Design a protein around this ligand. Structure first.
Ligand SMILES: O=P(O)(O)O[C@H]1[C@@H](OP(=O)(O)O)[C@H](OP(=O)(O)O)[C@@H](OP(=O)(O)OP(=O)(O)O)[C@H](OP(=O)(O)O)[C@H]1OP(=O)(O)O
Ligand SMILES: [Cl-]
Ligand SMILES: [Cl-]
Ligand SMILES: [F-]
Ligand SMILES: [Mg+2]
Ligand SMILES: [Mg+2]
Ligand SMILES: [Mg+2]
Length: 135
């Protein structure tokens, strides 16, 4: 409910690569709120004084309805066009919840993708999110 910003005015965000297992072969994407036929990596704005790892796990619970074991920070990713900067973490999913905030509120969808297929569906509208998987 309060947006936060880095010193250069980029919006602060956090997200997780929500993998099905420690193999990191399949990842959970969620539907775009604006365009539900498109896929995105779940994530969102850091609240004031919120640790990035805490914001990442919170936004994944809100948007994707999953919980799990937080892993490494992958990196910090800027979107120059939209002026935001996202901390991206690995999350190993251990709990899949049936009727989560965004399912109830906006009918948000979620789906498992093989990594190669996640990169494919993100490339057109979300190429920075496709890059999250590069390394
Ligand atoms: O105007 P669009 O439809 O492009 O909306 C974008 C975005 O605009 P941008 O590119 O100007 O930053 C929203 O920002 P805000 O308007 O809340 O600041 C962003 O929220 P966010 O950063 O994730 O923040 P949280 O709400 O999750 O904390 C939202 O994601 P959803 O959460 O998924 O609804 C995106 O939608 P899409 O990616 O299609 O699903
Ligand atoms: Cl996996
Ligand atoms: Cl992006
Ligand atoms: F949000
Ligand atoms: Mg959100
Ligand atoms: Mg969001
Ligand atoms: Mg939010």
């Amino acid at each position: 409910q309060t947006r936060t910003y880095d010193g250069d005015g980029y919006k602060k965000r956090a997200a997780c690569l929500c993998f099905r297992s420690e193999s990191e072969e399949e990842v959970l994407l969620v539907s775009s709120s604006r365009h539900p036929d498109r896929w995105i990596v779940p994530g969102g704005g850091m609240e004031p004084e919120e640790e990035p790892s805490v914001a990442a796990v919170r936004e994944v619970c809100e948007e994707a309805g999953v919980k799990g074991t937080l892993g490494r920070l992958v990196g910090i990713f800027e979107n120059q066009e939209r002026k935001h900067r996202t901390y991206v973490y690995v999350l190993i999913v251990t709990e899949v919840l049936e009727d989560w905030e965004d399912s109830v509120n906006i009918g948000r969808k979620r789906e498992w993708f093989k990594i190669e297929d996640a990169i494919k569906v993100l490339q057109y509208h979300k190429p920075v999110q496709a890059s999250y998987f590069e390394t």
